[PDB]
Design a protein around this ligand. Sequence first.
Ligand SMILES: CC(C)(COP(=O)(O)OP(=O)(O)OC[C@H]1O[C@@H](n2cnc3c(N)ncnc32)[C@H](O)[C@@H]1O)[C@@H](O)C(=O)NCCC(=O)NCCS
Ligand SMILES: CC(C)(COP(=O)(O)OP(=O)(O)OC[C@H]1O[C@@H](n2cnc3c(N)ncnc32)[C@H](O)[C@@H]1O)[C@@H](O)C(=O)NCCC(=O)NCCS
Ligand SMILES: CC(C)(COP(=O)(O)OP(=O)(O)OC[C@H]1O[C@@H](n2cnc3c(N)ncnc32)[C@H](O)[C@@H]1O)[C@@H](O)C(=O)NCCC(=O)NCCS
Lengths: 157, 157, 157, 157, 157, 157
Amino acid sequence: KRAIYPGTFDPITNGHIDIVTRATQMFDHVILAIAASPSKKPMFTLEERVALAQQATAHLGNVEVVGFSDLMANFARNQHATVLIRGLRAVADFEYEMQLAHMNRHLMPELESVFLMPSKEWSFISSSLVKEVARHQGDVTHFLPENVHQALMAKLA
Amino acid sequence: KRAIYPGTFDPITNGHIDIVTRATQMFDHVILAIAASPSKKPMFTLEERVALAQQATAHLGNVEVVGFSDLMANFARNQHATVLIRGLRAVADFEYEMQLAHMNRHLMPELESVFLMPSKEWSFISSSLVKEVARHQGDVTHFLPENVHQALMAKLA
Amino acid sequence: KRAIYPGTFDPITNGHIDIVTRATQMFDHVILAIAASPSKKPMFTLEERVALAQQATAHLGNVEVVGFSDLMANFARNQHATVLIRGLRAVADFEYEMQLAHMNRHLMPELESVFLMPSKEWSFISSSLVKEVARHQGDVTHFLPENVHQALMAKLA
Amino acid sequence: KRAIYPGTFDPITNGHIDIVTRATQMFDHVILAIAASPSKKPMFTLEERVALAQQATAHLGNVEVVGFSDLMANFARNQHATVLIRGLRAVADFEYEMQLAHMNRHLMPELESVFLMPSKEWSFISSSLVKEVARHQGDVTHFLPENVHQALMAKLA
Amino acid sequence: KRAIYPGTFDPITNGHIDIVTRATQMFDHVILAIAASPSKKPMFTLEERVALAQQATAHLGNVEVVGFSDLMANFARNQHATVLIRGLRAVADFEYEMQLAHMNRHLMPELESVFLMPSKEWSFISSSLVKEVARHQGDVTHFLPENVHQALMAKLA
Amino acid sequence: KRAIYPGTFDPITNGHIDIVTRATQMFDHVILAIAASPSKKPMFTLEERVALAQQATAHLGNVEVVGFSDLMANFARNQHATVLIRGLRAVADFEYEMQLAHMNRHLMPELESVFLMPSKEWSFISSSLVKEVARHQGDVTHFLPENVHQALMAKLA
Ligand SMILES: CC(C)(COP(=O)(O)OP(=O)(O)OC[C@H]1O[C@@H](n2cnc3c(N)ncnc32)[C@H](O)[C@@H]1O)[C@@H](O)C(=O)NCCC(=O)NCCS
Ligand SMILES: CC(C)(COP(=O)(O)OP(=O)(O)OC[C@H]1O[C@@H](n2cnc3c(N)ncnc32)[C@H](O)[C@@H]1O)[C@@H](O)C(=O)NCCC(=O)NCCS
Ligand SMILES: CC(C)(COP(=O)(O)OP(=O)(O)OC[C@H]1O[C@@H](n2cnc3c(N)ncnc32)[C@H](O)[C@@H]1O)[C@@H](O)C(=O)NCCC(=O)NCCS
């Protein structure tokens, strides 16, 4: 049973770690797939994002961090994933998640979307807000693995 | 890997069948658990709902239909389940499912909630709607397993 | 071109009047159809609701008030309607109206659902809210047709 | 500056306590007003709910617990309140609270509605959910004031 | 009775065809109005979009495809439209639709917003997602008229 | 009791005036804080926005208009504000408001988010839409203080 948990992870947060951890507890192998080139210039480069994610999940044995540049469904297919992990925060745009899951189902029906729920602690935080706050002199240490926190300070310095 | 898919299933619909089927694709064993739910004054007795669900899922070897009047979390623990399946049709489902999921996580943290999305075909039906239509002799054959439609026909005048 | 605007109208409010009025602007004939709705244990009997609606819409020559206990879709077909009018106040309405609209489309595909939006003035009222306020002697004259307010006054102590 | 925080509080929960506490931080006096709400067939009598709320808020010197069967707007005016406190957990709350707030503004324009947000810890609980869990002997000690949990234990078998 | 169904239609999809078809069944004349210059550079030029839309609706007699560059309300007014067609997918941002309808009502009250619902098949697809997927090597043939599919391949080649 | 009502106010609208007016009625001092440099180039400059806002609130004695460039929470802290005013329109993105309030609570817990509701008249209008319409030859006089209307015409001329 191979699951894929895709995203930009720019950068990976405690919320993402929460979700991938839950995924590793119900599925044999989990591929944390990092989108290479997003429509908008990411704060960290793919190599940086992969390194940070690898370090943050080093303790999770059945987790494999990989980068990809094609349509997520095309990558999932070549990787033989049959489960698609989506994290649903309390502040998630549910309508958008439905659009996405149905489009992904159209593209690869053999890939089943599965939604996991983070702990209440990370249920109201989005990576976008974390970055905006950090870029504007706010403390976001609480939302990030220590390794990511250190990399973020260097990036904004 | 044992998953539990609880609900009132009054009566079980093609939407429920869609969800439990997707559940069997990713988990070894799935327990379709029917709660007595006296507070909801169900149209069918627990025994009737269990019988209906059993016949509607007889073709699914990985599914086990059972009824329960206990706290769902205790029943799940006692059934050795570690995955809690829920279906999401839209926003309403999502909000209510989050409250329920967080309460269950508080009661049994090792029971991980997982939300699945039905096909577009069943994204707008519910037991309540089917019953209302049936109370007015409307044709609901399209939304229910053969045995369930028959039972509903009989149940009403 | 005959349209049907079904509901429980228990009792009819200025919000309902707003919607039916907009309906008459674009369709030749509009049937305001009041469902018996015993499952909702209406405050007013069907006969009372029809009488109230008739007087509240007497000034609208293109409106015809009628009561029905049949499946709404069959009543619409039997009334030769091809347009199904619904009012949308907000999200909640939208989600529920989609389930209802798709069920009706399954029952009668040639009955096309159309959603209209009320004025800002009536975007937050409902029969339920008006009744709750009235049960406590609150002034609801502003939200109801004169004849309806009188009837509500009488109905309560 | 007197604020009123009305509700059915059947029974009062840590979520309610969170909101009323935040209310006391910005307003001089806060009246926790418990409505009889017979239409909701409360589990506890008004007298029981008031007693429970009184003990659960005894440590809050700025809070005054009272019961009422009048129109909330008239009670607020008669209590000399000019601020109406409401708690928002999510979307559902927001939509319903807007209808209620606009009706109250129509009944008493000088009573200004104010919405507060609970901690993440209590963002997913409700009296209804706690009662359902308790009806099945589930552990709800974490979500209720000590005195309330005891009373709930007793109330049920 | 003249209705206007405005949008960017970049490019026109099966969902748009679904909606305009329903509009032609309840209104005498329907103007499929294509916005000339959108805030963001569209994939197809206005001439291309008009040609594609014309071909896709060639079978609908009471449909007129026209381009416009001014505020939609200004164009609707000069065109003497009294009905404004809006398609409401299950994944629509309802709040935004309300903002839009009320702004359009402020600008031209004689233009009544009417919301139609697409079939379940096209209820979860947005043009934006269709384009993104196509641009990223995904199959979107299913969502587009054959003429649009062919034009899209040439555009991305 | 010092409250802060932050935003871009580009430009200040009748809706903003509605909210700040309500805030001045329940709090001793209200700081209308105008964000200096927004992620996107604003229509009016900070000086212009401050001047317009000052003129529009000149009649409100306990209102102080000030500009700020740092993270809102950092400014609120240095200004010793303990109340954060947020206006909640009927078309507000509630999920986003929850994200924001929780992030602001993380950054400065001593600052309590308080949500106020505008009148029905301004409940469906966003500054973004007002600007878009104005820039595209639509009449938005109704939504703006006369001083802002005059400044807007000059800006677009
Ligand atoms: C009975 C329970 C599970 C609530 O059940 P519910 O009413 O949601 O069951 P229902 O038959 O309506 O639905 C079951 C599931 O199928 C989903 N579903 C229904 N129709 C569809 C459809 N057409 N497509 C996809 N999913 C669907 C629902 O969203 C839900 O996730 C709950 O009250 C419970 O756990 N009761 C036992 C007592 C207890 O322990 N209570 C405390 C719980 S915290
Ligand atoms: C009675 C029906 C139509 C449900 O009615 P409903 O409770 O929504 O009626 P109600 O009076 O509350 O509202 C009627 C319409 O007016 C709208 N409305 C109410 N207030 C407002 C307002 N203030 N502004 C705008 N619209 C409003 C509602 O959203 C609805 O669209 C439905 O149950 C039905 O069709 N019953 C007959 C049996 C049947 O065939 N059932 C199966 C249906 S699939
Ligand atoms: C009783 C009233 C206030 C409705 O009360 P309600 O059921 O919402 O009370 P309830 O105890 O459920 O909640 C009270 C408040 O606390 C909030 N709340 C509940 N749990 C939480 C939580 N965990 N976190 C944050 N807020 C919460 C609610 O959203 C609400 O704002 C209303 O019906 C009323 O005013 N009744 C009197 C008669 C009247 O005048 N009616 C007309 C009113 S317009």
